[model samples]
Target: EALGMVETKGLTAAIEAADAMVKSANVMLVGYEKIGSGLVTVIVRGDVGAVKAATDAGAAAARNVGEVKAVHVIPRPHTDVEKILPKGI
Candidate 1:
């Protein structure tokens, strides 16, 4: 069970979101997606509970930095989805 996402309007907000997500929950700052026009999405993976909590914290932090576009948590994401996702160190 894994997957969390937080979308924000700028790279600064996205970085803040990722930092807050990892700090607030038992989760890792896995990766990020940039969709042009300054949109950035932070991704995380961990237990379902942790991912949910992390997403919440991440969005809140991003809102402080700039506009938060959206947030989501996918519990027990499909294996295929994991394979296609960009790996984060």
Candidate 2:
């Protein structure tokens, strides 16, 4: 959601959206505490179009409320585990 379109006019909605992703959808939300940003990931067992629709829905739901800097959609699965793994393993 656009912050310009919301009533509270801040990141409140952004936080709510992130929380909702965890509670409502099966989406996994991570990296939200760094600052004014969030990440939502979900696995949908469906064809390409259905997955795209779900991604767009979640993106739109978050975007409709506040100062969203950016939203990136990956049409495939991913993880940031490499960042946590120790070097020279």
Candidate 3:
């Protein structure tokens, strides 16, 4: 499975991004992370294609709610990175 992420400046937008991500593709909502400076990230997991689609949708949707910080997709994340992902991913 690939990993998709969308970061936003606000919680509300992050939630919206997650919603759009799952709805746009065959992906699962993995988890969310919070960073200082009011940044939040929504994470999803699925095939590379699904993850890419989800990430794009998430970023677009998030932009409607608030500022988007970043969007990325890791087709095959390294094992070390996977281990560091939030729980239940």
Candidate 4:
């Protein structure tokens, strides 16, 4: 499985990004982490292709609604990074 992430500046847009992502493909909504300055990080897990598909759609979706800080997808993340990820991911 791969890990996809969408970083945005607002909660509403971040939620929209996650919604669009899961609806776009067979991806799991791992969860989001909030930063002190209104930054929200949305994360997902799925196949490499699915993660690529989901992350693009999510960035487009959130950009239309709000500012997108960044979007990224790691084809296959290892345990070291997995440990850095939020719980239950």
Q: All models: lDDT?
A: 0.90, 0.39, 0.92, 0.93
Looking at model 2, report the run of 10 residues with the lowest lDDT sum. Answer: 1-10
Could you tell me the TM-score of candidate 4? Answer: 0.94
Tens-digit lDDT string for candidate 3 (1-89): 79999999999999999999999999989889998799998999899999999999999999999999999999999988988896554
Q: What is the number of backbone collisions in each predicted candidate, taken in the order shown?
A: 0, 4, 0, 0
Superior by TM-score: candidate 1 or candidate 3: 3
Residue 27 CA error for candidate 2 (Å)? 1.9
lDDT of 1 by residue, 1-89 (tens): 68999999889999999999999999977788897999898999899999999999899888988999989889988888988776794
> What is the model-wide C-alpha lDDT for candidate 3?
0.92
Q: For candidate 3, give the lDDT of residue 65.
A: 94
Q: Please, what are the lDDT tens digits per residue for candidate 4 over residues 1-89?
A: 79999999999899999999999999999999987699999999989999999999999999999999989989989979988887554
Q: Residue 67 in model 4: shift from native, Å? A: 0.5
Could you estimate the TM-score for every candidate? 0.93, 0.40, 0.95, 0.94
Superior candidate under TM-score, 3 versus 4: 3
Higher lDDT: candidate 2 or 3? 3
Error of 2 at 78 (Å): 7.1
The C-alpha RMSD in Å for every predicted model, in order, reads 1.1, 9.2, 1.1, 1.2
Runs with alpha carbons beyond 4 Å of true place in candidate 2:
1-10, 33-55, 75-81, 84-89
CA deviation > 4 Å runs, candidate 3:
none
- Give the local distance difference test score of model 1: 0.90
**Lowest summed lDDT window (length 10), candidate 4:** 80-89
lDDT of 3 at 31: 81
Clashing pairs in model 2? Answer: 1-62, 1-63, 1-64, 1-65
On lDDT, who's better, 1 or 4? Answer: 4
